[PDB]
Each structure stands twice: as structure tokens, then as C-alpha cells.
Design an enzyme around this catalytic site. Structure first.
Site, mmCIF file in Angstrom:
data_model
loop_
_atom_site.group_PDB
_atom_site.id
_atom_site.type_symbol
_atom_site.label_atom_id
_atom_site.label_comp_id
_atom_site.label_asym_id
_atom_site.label_seq_id
_atom_site.Cartn_x
_atom_site.Cartn_y
_atom_site.Cartn_z
ATOM 1 C CG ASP A 257 -0.485 2.888 4.594
ATOM 2 O OD1 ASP A 257 0.033 1.864 4.136
ATOM 3 O OD2 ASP A 257 -1.537 2.821 5.272
ATOM 4 C CB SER B 281 0.470 -0.948 5.666
ATOM 5 O OG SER B 281 -0.548 -0.647 4.729
ATOM 6 C CG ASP C 225 -3.727 -4.906 1.868
ATOM 7 O OD1 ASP C 225 -3.616 -4.282 2.911
ATOM 8 O OD2 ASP C 225 -4.574 -4.568 1.014
ATOM 9 C CG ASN D 283 -1.798 -1.205 1.256
ATOM 10 O OD1 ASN D 283 -2.475 -1.473 0.286
ATOM 11 N ND2 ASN D 283 -1.767 -1.964 2.318
ATOM 12 C CG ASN E 126 -3.200 -2.616 6.172
ATOM 13 O OD1 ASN E 126 -2.807 -1.914 7.113
ATOM 14 N ND2 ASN E 126 -2.879 -2.388 4.913
ATOM 15 C CG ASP F 11 -12.541 -2.200 14.427
ATOM 16 O OD1 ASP F 11 -12.490 -2.311 15.669
ATOM 17 O OD2 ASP F 11 -11.839 -1.390 13.781
HETATM 18 CO CO LIG Z 1 -6.322 -3.565 0.700
#
Ligand SMILES: [Co+2]
Ligand SMILES: [Cl-]
EC number: 3.2.1.17
Length: 129
Positions: free
Chosen positions: A48, A50, A52, A46, A59, A101
Site C-alpha cells: 500500500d 506504507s 514498517d 508494504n 506501520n 486498539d
Molecule cells: Co507488517
């Protein structure tokens, strides 16, 4: 492992995803199709920093630890590599935390954009469940 559609549906049902938090099995199969093309080894980086992981593209910023995502919370308490297994248990267990969540399956952008509001029952049609 690259699952067949019905094979995955059956594995997901056995692990208690059918109607989990009100989401019928077809939703989960449709999400897995567009996130990973049913491949347990799928990884995607990703913007940012991170990554997946796995069949449901979980993530590393929030959910699992990959050792390279600063400030990862690891809320599923697992190494991200566990999510690449041919055995989907770890992915399913973590997915249950994610869907609980507060935003439901909207946590999966592919589900929102490609599955939500469609005839998701098609994804389990023909399968001996
Ligand atoms: Co994703
Ligand atoms: Cl919901």
C-alpha cells in the site's frame, strides 16, 4: 542493534511489556523475532506504499510519520525513524497503543500466524529475568 533473545526479553520486561494487556513476555519476544529478527533497524515496504519500522515493524499508515505515506495518522506522534533506535523505548510505547486498539496482538500478522497458540514461554526459557 541486533538484540539477543534474553537481552530483548529483559529490556521488554523493564519497559513494562510483561503481561501488558494480558500478553505474557514470550508473546512479545516471539513477535519481535518474526517481525524483525530482533534488529532495531529493520524496515520493510508494504504493498500500500506504507513502510514498517523497527523491532516490532510498526506501520507508517497509522502509527508514525515517515514523510512519504499520504494520509498517515501518526497516532504514536513520532517520526518513524525514532523506531529504529538501539533504545527500544519509543517502539515499546507505541506498541502499547497498538495492542490497546481493540484487536490485541492480532495487529501483528506474524504474531497471529507464528506465535498465537504456540508455547511462547519457550522464548524466555533460560533467561535471567
Ligand atoms: Co507488517
Ligand atoms: Cl486481547
Amino acid at each position: 542493534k541486533v538484540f539477543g533473545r534474553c537481552e530483548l526479553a529483559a529490556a521488554m520486561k523493564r519497559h513494562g511489556l510483561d503481561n501488558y494487556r494480558g500478553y505474557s513476555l514470550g508473546n512479545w519476544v516471539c513477535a519481535a523475532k518474526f517481525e524483525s529478527n530482533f534488529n532495531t533497524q529493520a524496515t520493510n515496504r508494504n504493498t500500500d506504499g506504507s513502510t514498517d519500522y523497527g523491532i516490532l515493524q510498526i506501520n507508517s499508515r497509522w502509527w508514525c510519520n515517515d514523510g512519504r505515506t499520504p494520509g498517515s495518522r501518526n497516532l504514536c506522534n513520532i517520526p518513524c525513524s525514532a523506531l529504529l533506535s538501539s533504545d527500544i523505548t519509543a517502539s515499546v510505547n507505541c506498541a502499547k497503543k497498538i495492542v490497546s486498539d481493540g484487536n490485541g496482538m492480532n495487529a501483528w500478522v506474524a504474531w497471529r500466524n507464528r506465535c498465537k497458540g504456540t508455547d511462547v514461554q519457550a522464548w524466555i526459557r533460560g533467561c535471567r529475568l
